[PDB]
Structure formats: structure tokens, C-alpha cells
């Protein structure tokens, strides 16, 4: 009751926040729901993911704009430390959110039990937010962060290739994000191209067997895989 009703309330308020595009509030509500101890359903997992995706999404975009300006500061002007100071402020906010997500994954969500979908979902999410931290890391902390992201993706990879078909949307999304990691973070464009191509090829061979449930979902991810390949290969 005190927990069951509070959880239900937080979930309903998370859905209200989503409709209102109040993604910071949404993230807060879902974090509160997670801490009630009960596991998240597929719907609730997506609420958590959509909430924090938009939060860090805005921060990452803001960080990218400020970094580009900072890199072109001494070229032409701005001249002063304003860009760096504000970029570091945004960077610090971003790292706080990522640290909140990762802390929630290790504390409540990542378990040895549970179906393959949920386990791959949270391990992918762990890799995603270590990857976001790597986007802004500069030095030795970067290497540890990169390794943490690779280990989370690889563990998710091993589970997906063992317990889910090649057309499964969660597997496809994992492979997509892991290839982006290889290309952008690890600077290994050969592994990224190879992983994306293998993912697309093996999914294509089973598309005729794909259910209408995942038809659209898997199809969209496959379009992304092929769009990235067209870009990575041509240059």
C-alpha cells in the first residue's frame, strides 16, 4: 500500500510528465518507482529509458554545441573563459545524470535473474551511459570508462546472441549502439562496419519469419544499421 500505491502514483505521474514533455520530472518519478524495490515491466522499463534519454539528450546536444564553439574560440572574438566555464558546467550536469542512471542500474535493475530481454536491456543501458561519459572524458578516466562500456555491451552481446533471435529489436538495438561505440569511442571503424554489416545481414535472413509485433521495431533499427554502414563505408 504505502509502497504499492506510491509506486503506482509515481508511474502515473511519469506517464503524465511524458505527455507534457517534462522529461526531468519523468526521470525523477521513474527513479522513485525503481527504488520501491519491485522489478520494472516492459512498459515501465521504456518509461525509465525514454525519460533519461531525453534528459541526457539535451545535455549532450548542448555539450556538443559548446565544445564546437570552445574549439573555435582561439581560431578567430569570444576570447575569454566563458565558453569553457559554461561547457564544464554542462559537462558536470551530464555526468551527474549518467552517474544517477548507472547507480540505479547497479543498485536495483541489473540482476542475474530475469528474462533475457530485461537483462540485455539494462546491460545495454549501462553501456550507453558509460559511452555518454566517454564522449566527454579527456584522459586516463576515459580508458576506464571506455572499458566499462565495452564490458557492459559485450556481456549484453553474449546474452543476446545466445537467447534471442537475430531479428529481436533489443538485440538489434544493442548491436547498433555497440557498433557506434566501436566507431566513435573506440575509434575502431573496421569493427563497427563489420558488426553493423553482420547484424544487418543475419537479421535480413530471418526477416520473413519476423512477427508483426516486432516488424516495425526491427525494421526501423535495420534502417539505422544500413544508414550508418552507407556513411562509414563511403568514408
Amino acid at each position: 500500500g504505502a509502497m504499492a500505491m506510491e509506486r503506482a502514483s509515481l508511474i502515473q505521474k511519469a506517464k503524465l510528465a511524458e505527455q507534457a514533455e517534462r522529461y526531468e520530472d519523468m526521470a525523477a518519478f521513474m527513479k522513485g518507482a525503481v527504488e520501491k524495490g519491485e522489478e520494472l515491466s516492459c512498459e515501465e522499463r521504456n518509461l525509465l529509458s525514454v525519460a533519461y534519454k531525453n534528459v541526457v539528450g539535451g545535455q549532450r546536444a548542448a555539450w556538443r554545441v559548446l565544445s564546437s564553439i570552445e574549439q573555435k574560440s582561439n581560431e578567430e572574438e569570444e576570447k575569454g573563459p566563458e565558453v569553457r566555464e559554461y561547457r564544464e558546467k554542462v559537462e558536470t550536469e551530464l555526468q551527474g545524470v549518467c552517474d544517477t542512471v548507472l547507480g540505479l542500474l547497479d543498485s536495483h535493475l541489473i540482476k542475474e535473474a530475469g528474462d533475457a530481454e530485461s537483462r540485455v536491456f539494462y546491460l545495454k543501458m549501462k553501456g550507453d551511459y558509460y559511452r555518454y561519459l566517454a564522449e566527454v572524458a579527456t584522459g586516463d578516466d576515459k580508458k576506464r570508462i571506455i572499458d566499462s562500456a565495452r564490458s557492459a555491451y559485450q556481456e549484453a552481446m553474449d546474452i543476446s546472441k545466445k537467447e534471442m533471435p537475430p531479428t529481436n529489436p533489443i538485440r538489434l538495438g544493442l548491436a547498433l549502439n555497440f557498433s557506434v561505440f566501436h566507431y566513435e569511442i573506440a575509434n575502431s571503424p573496421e569493427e563497427a562496419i563489420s558488426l553493423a554489416k553482420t547484424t544487418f545481414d543475419e537479421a535480413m535472413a530471418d526477416l520473413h519469419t519476423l512477427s508483426e509485433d516486432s516488424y516495425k521495431d526491427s525494421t526501423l533499427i535495420m534502417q539505422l544499421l544500413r544508414d550508418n554502414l552507407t556513411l562509414w563505408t563511403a568514408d
Partner: peptide, 11 residues
């Protein structure tokens, strides 16, 4: 954002 390759979250 200036990035052209995409992650799954863009959906």
C-alpha cells in the same frame, strides 16, 4: 548536433 551516424535512441 553535428553527428550523422545514429544510435537506436533517436527513434
Amino acid at each position: 548536433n553535428y553527428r550523422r551516424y545514429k544510435s537506436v535512441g533517436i527513434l
